[PDB]
CSV table of N, CA and C and ligand atoms in Angstrom, one decimal:
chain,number,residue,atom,x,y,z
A,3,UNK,N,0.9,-1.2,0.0
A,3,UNK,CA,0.0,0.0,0.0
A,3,UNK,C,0.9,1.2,0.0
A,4,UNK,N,2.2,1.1,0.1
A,4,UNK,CA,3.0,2.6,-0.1
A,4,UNK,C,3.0,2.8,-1.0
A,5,UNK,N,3.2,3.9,-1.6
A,5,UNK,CA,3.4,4.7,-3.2
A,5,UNK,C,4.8,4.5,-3.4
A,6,UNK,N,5.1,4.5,-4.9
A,6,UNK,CA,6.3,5.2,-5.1
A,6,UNK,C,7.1,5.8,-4.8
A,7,UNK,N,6.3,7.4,-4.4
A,7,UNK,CA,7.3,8.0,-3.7
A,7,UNK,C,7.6,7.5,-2.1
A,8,UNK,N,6.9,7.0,-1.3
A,8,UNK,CA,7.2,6.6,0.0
A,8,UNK,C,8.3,5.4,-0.2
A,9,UNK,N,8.2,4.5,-0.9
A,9,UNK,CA,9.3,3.9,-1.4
A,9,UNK,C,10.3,4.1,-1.4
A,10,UNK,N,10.9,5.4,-2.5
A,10,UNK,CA,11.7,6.0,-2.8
A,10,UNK,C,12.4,6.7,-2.1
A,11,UNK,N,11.6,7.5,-1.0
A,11,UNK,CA,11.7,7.8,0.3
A,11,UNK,C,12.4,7.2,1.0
A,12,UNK,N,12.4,6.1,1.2
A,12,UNK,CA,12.8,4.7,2.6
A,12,UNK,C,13.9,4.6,1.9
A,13,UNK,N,13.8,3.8,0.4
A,13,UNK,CA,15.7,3.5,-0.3
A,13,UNK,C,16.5,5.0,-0.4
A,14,UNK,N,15.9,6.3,-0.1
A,14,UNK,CA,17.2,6.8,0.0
A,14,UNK,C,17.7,6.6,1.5
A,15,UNK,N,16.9,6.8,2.6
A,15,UNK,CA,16.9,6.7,3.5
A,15,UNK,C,17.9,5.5,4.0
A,16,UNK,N,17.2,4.1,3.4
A,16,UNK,CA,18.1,3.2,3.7
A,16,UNK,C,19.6,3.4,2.8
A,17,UNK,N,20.2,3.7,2.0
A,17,UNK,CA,21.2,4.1,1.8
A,17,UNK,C,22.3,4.8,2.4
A,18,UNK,N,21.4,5.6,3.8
A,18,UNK,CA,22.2,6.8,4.3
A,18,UNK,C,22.7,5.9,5.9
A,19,UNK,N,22.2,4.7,5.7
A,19,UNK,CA,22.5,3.6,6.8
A,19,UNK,C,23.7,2.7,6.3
A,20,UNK,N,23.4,1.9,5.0
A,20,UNK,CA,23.8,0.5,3.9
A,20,UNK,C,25.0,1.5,3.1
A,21,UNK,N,25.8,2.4,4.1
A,21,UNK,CA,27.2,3.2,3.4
A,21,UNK,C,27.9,2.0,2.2
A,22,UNK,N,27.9,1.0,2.9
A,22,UNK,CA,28.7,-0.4,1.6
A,22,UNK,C,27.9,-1.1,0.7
A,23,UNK,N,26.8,-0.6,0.8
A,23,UNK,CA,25.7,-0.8,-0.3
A,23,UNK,C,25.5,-2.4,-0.5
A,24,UNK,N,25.9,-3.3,0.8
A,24,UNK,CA,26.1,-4.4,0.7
A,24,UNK,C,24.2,-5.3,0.9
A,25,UNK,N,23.3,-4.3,1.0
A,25,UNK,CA,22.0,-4.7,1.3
A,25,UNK,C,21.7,-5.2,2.3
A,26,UNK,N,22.8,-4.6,3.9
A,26,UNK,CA,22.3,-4.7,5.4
A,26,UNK,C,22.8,-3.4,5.7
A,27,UNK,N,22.2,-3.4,6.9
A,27,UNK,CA,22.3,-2.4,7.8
A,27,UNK,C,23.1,-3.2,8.9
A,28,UNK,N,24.1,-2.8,9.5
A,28,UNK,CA,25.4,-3.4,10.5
A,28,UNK,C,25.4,-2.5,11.5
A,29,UNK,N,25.2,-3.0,12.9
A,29,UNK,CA,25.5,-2.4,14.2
A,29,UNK,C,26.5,-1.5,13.7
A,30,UNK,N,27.6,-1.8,13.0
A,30,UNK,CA,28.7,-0.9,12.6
A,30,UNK,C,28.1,0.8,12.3
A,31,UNK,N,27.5,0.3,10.4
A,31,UNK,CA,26.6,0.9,9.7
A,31,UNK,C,25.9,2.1,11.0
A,32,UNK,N,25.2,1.9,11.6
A,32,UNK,CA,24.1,2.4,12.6
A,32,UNK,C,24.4,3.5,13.3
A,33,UNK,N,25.5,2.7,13.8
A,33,UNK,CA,26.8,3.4,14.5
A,33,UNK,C,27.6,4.9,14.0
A,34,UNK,N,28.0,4.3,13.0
A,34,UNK,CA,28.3,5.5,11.9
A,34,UNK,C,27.3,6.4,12.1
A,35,UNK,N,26.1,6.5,11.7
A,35,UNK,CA,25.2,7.1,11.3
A,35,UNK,C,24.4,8.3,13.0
A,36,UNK,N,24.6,7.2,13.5
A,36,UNK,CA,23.9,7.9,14.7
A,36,UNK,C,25.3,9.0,15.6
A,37,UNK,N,26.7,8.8,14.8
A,37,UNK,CA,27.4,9.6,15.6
A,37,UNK,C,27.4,10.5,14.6
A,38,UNK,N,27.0,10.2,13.8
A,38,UNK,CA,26.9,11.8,12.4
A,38,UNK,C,25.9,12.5,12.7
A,39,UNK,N,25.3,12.2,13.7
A,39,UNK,CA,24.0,12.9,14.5
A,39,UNK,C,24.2,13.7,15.9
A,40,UNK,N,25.3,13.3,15.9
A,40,UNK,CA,26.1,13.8,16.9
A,40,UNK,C,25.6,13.2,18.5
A,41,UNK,N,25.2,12.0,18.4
A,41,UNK,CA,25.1,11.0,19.5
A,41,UNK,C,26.6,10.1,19.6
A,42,UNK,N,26.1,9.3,20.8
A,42,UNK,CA,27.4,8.6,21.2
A,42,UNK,C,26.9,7.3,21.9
A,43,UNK,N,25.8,6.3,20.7
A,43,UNK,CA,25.4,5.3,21.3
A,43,UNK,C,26.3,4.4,21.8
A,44,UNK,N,26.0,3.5,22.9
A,44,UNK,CA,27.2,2.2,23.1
A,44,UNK,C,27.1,0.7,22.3
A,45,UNK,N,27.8,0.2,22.0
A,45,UNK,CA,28.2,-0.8,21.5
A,45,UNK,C,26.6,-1.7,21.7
A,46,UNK,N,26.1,-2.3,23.3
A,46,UNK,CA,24.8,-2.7,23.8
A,46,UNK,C,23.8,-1.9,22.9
A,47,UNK,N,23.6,-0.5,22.9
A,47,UNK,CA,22.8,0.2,22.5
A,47,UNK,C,22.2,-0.2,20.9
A,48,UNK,N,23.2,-0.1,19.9
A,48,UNK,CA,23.0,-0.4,18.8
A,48,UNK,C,22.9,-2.0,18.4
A,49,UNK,N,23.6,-3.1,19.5
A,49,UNK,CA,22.8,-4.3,18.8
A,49,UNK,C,21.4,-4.5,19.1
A,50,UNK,N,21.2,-3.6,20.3
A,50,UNK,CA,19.3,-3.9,20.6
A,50,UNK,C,18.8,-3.3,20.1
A,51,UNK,N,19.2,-2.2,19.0
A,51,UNK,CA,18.7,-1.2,17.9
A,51,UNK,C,18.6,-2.2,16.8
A,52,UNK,N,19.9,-2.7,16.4
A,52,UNK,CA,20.0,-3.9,15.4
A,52,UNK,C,18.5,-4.8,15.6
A,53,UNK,N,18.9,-5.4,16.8
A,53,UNK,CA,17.9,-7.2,16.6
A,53,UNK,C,16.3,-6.5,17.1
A,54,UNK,N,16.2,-5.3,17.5
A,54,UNK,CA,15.0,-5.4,17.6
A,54,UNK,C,14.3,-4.7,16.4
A,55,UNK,N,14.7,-4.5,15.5
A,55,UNK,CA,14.2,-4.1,13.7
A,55,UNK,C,14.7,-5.6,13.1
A,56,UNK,N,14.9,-6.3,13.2
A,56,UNK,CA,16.0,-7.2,12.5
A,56,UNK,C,14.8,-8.2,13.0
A,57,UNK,N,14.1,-9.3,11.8
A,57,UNK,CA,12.9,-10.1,11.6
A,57,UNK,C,13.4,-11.8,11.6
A,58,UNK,N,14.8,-11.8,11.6
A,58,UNK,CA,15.3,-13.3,11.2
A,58,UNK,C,15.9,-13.9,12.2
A,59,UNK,N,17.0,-13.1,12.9
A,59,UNK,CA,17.6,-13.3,13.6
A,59,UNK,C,19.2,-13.3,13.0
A,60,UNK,N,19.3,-12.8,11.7
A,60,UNK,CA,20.7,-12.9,11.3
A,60,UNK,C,21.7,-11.5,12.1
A,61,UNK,N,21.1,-10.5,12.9
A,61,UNK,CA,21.9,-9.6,13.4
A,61,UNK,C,22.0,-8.6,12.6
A,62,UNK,N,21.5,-8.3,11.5
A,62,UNK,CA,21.5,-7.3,10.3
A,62,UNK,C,19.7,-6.7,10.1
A,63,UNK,N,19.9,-5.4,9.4
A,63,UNK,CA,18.6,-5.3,8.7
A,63,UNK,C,18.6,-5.2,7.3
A,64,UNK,N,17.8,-5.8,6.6
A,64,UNK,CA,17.6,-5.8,5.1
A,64,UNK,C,17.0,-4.7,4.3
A,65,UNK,N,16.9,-4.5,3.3
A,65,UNK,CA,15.6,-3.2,2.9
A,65,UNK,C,14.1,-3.9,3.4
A,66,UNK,N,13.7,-4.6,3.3
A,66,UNK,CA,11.9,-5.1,3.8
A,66,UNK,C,12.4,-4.9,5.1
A,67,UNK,N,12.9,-5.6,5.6
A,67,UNK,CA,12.8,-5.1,7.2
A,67,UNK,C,12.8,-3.6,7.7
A,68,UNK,N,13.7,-3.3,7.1
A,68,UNK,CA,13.6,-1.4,7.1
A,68,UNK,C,12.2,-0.8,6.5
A,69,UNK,N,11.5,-1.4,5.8
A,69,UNK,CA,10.3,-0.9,5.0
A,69,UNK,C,9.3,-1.0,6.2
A,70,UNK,N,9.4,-2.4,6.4
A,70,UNK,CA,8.0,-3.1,7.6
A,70,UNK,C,8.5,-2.2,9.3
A,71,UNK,N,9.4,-1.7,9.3
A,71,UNK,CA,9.8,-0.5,10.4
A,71,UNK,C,9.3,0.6,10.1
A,72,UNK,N,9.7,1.2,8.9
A,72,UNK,CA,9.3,2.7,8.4
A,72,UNK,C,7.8,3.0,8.2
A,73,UNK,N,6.9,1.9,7.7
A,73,UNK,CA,5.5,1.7,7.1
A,73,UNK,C,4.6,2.1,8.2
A,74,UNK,N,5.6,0.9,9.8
A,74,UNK,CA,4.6,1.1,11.3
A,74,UNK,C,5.0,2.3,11.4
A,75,UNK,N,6.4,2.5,11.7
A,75,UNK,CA,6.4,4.3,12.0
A,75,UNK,C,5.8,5.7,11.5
A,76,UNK,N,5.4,5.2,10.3
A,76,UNK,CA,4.9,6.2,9.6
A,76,UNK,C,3.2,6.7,9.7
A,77,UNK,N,2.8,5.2,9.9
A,77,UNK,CA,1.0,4.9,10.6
A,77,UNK,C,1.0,5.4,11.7
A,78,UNK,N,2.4,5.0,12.6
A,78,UNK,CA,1.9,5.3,14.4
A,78,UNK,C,2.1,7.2,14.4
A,79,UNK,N,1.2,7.3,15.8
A,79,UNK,CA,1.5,8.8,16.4
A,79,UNK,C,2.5,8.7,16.9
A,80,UNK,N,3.5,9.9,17.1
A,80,UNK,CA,4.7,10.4,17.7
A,80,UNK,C,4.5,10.5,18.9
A,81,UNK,N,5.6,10.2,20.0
A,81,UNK,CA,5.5,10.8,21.4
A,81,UNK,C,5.9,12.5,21.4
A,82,UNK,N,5.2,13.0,22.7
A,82,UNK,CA,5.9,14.5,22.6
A,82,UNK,C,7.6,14.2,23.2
A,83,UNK,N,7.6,12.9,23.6
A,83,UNK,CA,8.9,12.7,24.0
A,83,UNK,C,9.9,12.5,22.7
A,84,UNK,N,10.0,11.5,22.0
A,84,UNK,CA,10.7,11.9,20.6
A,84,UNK,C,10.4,13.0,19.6
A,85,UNK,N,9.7,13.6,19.9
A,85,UNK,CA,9.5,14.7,19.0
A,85,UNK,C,10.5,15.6,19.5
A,86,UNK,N,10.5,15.9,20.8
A,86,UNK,CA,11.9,17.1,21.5
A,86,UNK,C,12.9,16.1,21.4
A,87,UNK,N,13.3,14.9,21.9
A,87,UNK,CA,14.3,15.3,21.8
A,87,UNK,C,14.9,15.0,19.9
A,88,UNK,N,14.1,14.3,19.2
A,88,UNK,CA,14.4,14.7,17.9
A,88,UNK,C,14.9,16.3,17.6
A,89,UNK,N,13.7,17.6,17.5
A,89,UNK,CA,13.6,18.8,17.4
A,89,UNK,C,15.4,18.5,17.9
A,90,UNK,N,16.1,18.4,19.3
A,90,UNK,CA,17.3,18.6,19.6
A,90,UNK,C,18.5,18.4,18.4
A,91,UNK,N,18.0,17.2,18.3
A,91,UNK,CA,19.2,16.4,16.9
A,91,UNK,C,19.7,17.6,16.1
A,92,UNK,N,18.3,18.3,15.4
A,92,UNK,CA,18.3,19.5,14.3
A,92,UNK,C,18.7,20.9,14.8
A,93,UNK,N,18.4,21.5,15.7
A,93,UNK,CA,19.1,22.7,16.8
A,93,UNK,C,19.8,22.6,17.4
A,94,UNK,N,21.1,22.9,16.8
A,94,UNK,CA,23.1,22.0,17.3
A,94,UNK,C,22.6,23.4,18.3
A,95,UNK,N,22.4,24.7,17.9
A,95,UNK,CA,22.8,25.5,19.0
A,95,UNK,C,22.1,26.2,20.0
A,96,UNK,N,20.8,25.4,20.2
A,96,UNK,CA,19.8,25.2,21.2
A,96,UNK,C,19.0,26.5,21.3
A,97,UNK,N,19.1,27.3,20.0
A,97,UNK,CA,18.4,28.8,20.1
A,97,UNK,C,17.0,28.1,19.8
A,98,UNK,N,16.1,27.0,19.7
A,98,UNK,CA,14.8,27.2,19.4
A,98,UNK,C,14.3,27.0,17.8
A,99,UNK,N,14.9,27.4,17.1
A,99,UNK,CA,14.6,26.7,15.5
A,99,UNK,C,15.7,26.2,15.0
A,100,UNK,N,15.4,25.4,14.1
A,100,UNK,CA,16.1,24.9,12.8
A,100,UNK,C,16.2,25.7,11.8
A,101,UNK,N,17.5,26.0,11.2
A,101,UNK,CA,18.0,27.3,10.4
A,101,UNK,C,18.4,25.7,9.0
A,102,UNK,N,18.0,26.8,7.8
A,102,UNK,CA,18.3,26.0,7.1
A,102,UNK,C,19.6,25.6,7.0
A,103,UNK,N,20.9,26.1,7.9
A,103,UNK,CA,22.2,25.4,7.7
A,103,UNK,C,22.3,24.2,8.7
A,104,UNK,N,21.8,24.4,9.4
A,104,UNK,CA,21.3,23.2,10.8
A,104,UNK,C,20.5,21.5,9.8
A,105,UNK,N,19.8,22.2,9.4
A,105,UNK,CA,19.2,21.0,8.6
A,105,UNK,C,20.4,20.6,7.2
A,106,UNK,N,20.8,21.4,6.6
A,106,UNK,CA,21.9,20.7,5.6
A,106,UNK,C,22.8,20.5,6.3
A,107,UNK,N,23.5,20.4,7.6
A,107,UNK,CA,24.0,20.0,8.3
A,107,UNK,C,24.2,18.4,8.8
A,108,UNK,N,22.8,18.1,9.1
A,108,UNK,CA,22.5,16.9,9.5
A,108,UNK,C,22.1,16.1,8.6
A,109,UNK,N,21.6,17.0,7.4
A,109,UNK,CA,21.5,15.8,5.6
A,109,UNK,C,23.7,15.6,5.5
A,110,UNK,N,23.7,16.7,5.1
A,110,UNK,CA,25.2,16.3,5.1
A,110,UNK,C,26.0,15.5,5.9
A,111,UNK,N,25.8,15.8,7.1
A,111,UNK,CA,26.5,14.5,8.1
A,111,UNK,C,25.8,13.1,8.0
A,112,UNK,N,24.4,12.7,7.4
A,112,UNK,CA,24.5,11.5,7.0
A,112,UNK,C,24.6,10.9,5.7
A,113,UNK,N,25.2,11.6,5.2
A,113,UNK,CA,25.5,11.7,3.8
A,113,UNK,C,24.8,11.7,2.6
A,114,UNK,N,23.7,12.8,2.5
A,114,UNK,CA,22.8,12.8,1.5
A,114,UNK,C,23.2,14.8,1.2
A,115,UNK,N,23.5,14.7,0.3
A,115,UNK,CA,24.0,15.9,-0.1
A,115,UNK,C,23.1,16.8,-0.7
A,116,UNK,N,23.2,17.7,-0.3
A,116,UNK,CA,21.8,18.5,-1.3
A,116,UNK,C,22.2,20.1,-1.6
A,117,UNK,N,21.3,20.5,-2.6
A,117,UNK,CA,22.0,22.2,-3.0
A,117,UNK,C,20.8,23.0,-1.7
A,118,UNK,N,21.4,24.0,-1.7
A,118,UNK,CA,20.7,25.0,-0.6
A,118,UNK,C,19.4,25.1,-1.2
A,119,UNK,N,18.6,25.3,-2.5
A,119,UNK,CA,17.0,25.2,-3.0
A,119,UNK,C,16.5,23.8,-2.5
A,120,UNK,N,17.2,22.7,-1.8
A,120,UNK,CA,16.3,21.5,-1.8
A,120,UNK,C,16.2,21.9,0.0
A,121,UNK,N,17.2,22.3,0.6
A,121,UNK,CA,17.0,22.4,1.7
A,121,UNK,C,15.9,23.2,1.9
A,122,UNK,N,16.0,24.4,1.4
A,122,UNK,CA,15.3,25.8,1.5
A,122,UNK,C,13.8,24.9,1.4
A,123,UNK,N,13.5,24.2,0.2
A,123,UNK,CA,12.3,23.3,0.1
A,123,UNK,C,12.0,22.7,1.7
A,124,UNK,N,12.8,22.0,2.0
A,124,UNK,CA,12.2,20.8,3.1
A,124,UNK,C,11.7,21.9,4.1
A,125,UNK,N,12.4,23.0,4.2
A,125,UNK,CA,12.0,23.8,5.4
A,125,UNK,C,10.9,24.3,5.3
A,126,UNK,N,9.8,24.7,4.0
A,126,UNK,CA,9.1,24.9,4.0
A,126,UNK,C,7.4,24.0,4.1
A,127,UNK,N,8.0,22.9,3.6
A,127,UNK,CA,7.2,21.7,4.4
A,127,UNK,C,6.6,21.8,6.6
A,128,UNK,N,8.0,22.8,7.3
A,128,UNK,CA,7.2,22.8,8.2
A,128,UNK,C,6.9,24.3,8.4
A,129,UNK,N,7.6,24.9,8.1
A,129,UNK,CA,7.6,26.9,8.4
A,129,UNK,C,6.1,27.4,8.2
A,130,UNK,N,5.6,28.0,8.8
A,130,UNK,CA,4.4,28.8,9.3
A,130,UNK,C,4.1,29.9,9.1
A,131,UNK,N,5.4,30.1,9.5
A,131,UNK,CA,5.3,31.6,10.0
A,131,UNK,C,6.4,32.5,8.8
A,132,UNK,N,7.1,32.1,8.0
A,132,UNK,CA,7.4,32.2,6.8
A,132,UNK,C,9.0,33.2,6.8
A,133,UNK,N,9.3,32.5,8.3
A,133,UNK,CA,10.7,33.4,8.6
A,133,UNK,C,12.1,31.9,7.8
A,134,UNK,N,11.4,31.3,7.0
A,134,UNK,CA,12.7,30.1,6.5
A,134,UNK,C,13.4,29.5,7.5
A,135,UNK,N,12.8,29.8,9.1
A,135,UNK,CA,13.3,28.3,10.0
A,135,UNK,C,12.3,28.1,10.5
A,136,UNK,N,12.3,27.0,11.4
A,136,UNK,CA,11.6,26.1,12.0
A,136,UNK,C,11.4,26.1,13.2
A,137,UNK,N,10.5,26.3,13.9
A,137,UNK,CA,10.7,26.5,15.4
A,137,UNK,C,10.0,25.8,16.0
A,138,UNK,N,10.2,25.3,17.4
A,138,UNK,CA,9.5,23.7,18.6
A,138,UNK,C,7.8,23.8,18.0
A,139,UNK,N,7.2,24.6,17.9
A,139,UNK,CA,5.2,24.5,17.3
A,139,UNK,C,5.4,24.1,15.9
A,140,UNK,N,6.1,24.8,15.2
A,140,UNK,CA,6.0,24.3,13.4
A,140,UNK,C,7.0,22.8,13.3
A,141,UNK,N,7.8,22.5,14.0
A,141,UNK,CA,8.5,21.3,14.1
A,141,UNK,C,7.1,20.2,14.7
A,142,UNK,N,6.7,20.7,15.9
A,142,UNK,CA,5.4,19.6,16.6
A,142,UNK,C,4.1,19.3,15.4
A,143,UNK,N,4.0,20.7,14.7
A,143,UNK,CA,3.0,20.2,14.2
A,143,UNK,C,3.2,19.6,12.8
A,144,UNK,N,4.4,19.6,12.2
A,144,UNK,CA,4.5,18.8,11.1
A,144,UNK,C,4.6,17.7,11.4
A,145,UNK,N,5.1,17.2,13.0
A,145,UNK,CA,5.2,15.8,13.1
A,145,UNK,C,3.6,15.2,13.5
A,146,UNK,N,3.1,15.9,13.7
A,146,UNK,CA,1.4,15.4,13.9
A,146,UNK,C,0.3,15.9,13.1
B,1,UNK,N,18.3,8.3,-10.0
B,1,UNK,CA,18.2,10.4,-10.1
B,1,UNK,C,18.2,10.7,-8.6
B,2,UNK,N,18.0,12.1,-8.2
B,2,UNK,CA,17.6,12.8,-7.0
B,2,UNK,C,16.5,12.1,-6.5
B,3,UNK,N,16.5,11.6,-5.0
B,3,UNK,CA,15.3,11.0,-4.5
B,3,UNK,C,15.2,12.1,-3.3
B,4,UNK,N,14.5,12.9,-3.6
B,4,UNK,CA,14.0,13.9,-1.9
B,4,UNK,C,13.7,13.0,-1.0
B,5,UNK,N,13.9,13.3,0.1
B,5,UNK,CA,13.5,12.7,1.6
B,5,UNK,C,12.8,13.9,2.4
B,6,UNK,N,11.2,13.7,2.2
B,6,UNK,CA,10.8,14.8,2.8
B,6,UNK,C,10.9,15.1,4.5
B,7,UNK,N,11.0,16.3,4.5
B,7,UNK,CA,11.3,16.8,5.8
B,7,UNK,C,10.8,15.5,7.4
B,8,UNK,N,9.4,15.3,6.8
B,8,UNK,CA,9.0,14.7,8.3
B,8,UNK,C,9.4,13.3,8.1
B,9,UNK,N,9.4,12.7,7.3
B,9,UNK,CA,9.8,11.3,7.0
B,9,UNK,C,11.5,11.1,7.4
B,10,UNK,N,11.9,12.4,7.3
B,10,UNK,CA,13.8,12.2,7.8
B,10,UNK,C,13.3,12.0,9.4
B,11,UNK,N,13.0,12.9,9.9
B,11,UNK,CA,12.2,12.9,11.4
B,11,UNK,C,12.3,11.6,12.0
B,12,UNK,N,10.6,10.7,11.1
B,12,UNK,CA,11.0,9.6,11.6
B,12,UNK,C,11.8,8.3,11.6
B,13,UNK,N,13.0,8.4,10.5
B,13,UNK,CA,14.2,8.2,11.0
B,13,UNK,C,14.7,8.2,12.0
B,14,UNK,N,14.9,9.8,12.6
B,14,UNK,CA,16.0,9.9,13.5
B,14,UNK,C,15.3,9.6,14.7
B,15,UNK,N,14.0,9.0,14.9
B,15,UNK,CA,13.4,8.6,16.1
B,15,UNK,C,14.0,7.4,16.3
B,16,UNK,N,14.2,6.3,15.3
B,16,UNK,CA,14.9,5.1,15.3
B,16,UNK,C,13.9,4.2,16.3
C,1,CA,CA1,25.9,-2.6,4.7
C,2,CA,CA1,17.7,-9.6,9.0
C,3,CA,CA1,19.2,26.5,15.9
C,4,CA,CA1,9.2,29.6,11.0
């Protein structure tokens, strides 16, 4: 029941995980990706991230496994709890919005590269108030 | 080609 574009969506997504393009996602992989976010998960942290997305038991995630994760996450409601501290991920410097260098920032650090007109785009997906950032209300309510 | 990742779908990514 996803579209195309939701599809399309998820494989870039999973790409910015599957850096060796080897068609898993590796504790390693994860790893990478969550310190390009500027976290500092532990070694425990990421294999219970691993095997609890992970459908087989082989210790890896696949693309369907990533799909059948992304598809429930996309149906379910958000907590107000991951919504802030998400919102944090994107405001390195805790002033209150997401400036569009904050968000090419965080596309860049997981390695999806983009010209400043695509960024400029996503921001307006949540902006409101028409100042080109994002602030904790226009962030909440794009995620709900 | 270019695949956008729109803004709230990166989101719930980084919820993990
Ligand atoms: Ca891989
Ligand atoms: Ca697997
Ligand atoms: Ca900021
Ligand atoms: Ca705004």
């Amino acid at each position: 029941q996803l579209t195309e574009e939701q599809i399309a969506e998820f494989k870039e997504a999973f790409s910015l995980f599957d850096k060796d393009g080897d068609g898993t996602i590796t504790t390693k992989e994860l790893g990478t990706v969550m310190r390009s976010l500027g976290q500092n998960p532990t070694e425990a942290e990421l294999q219970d991230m691993i095997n609890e997305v992970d459908a087989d038991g082989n210790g890896t995630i696949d693309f369907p496994e990533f799909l059948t994760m992304m598809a429930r996450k996309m149906k379910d409601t958000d907590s107000e709890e991951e919504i802030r501290e998400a919102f944090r991920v994107f405001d390195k410097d805790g002033n209150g919005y997401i400036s569009a260098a904050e968000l090419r920032h965080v596309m860049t650090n997981l390695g999806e590269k983009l010209t400043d007109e695509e960024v400029d785009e996503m921001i307006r997906e949540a902006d409101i108030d028409g100042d080109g950032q994002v602030n904790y209300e226009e962030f909440v309510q794009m995620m709900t | 080609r270019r695949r956008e990742i729109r803004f709230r779908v990166l989101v719930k990514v980084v919820f993990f």
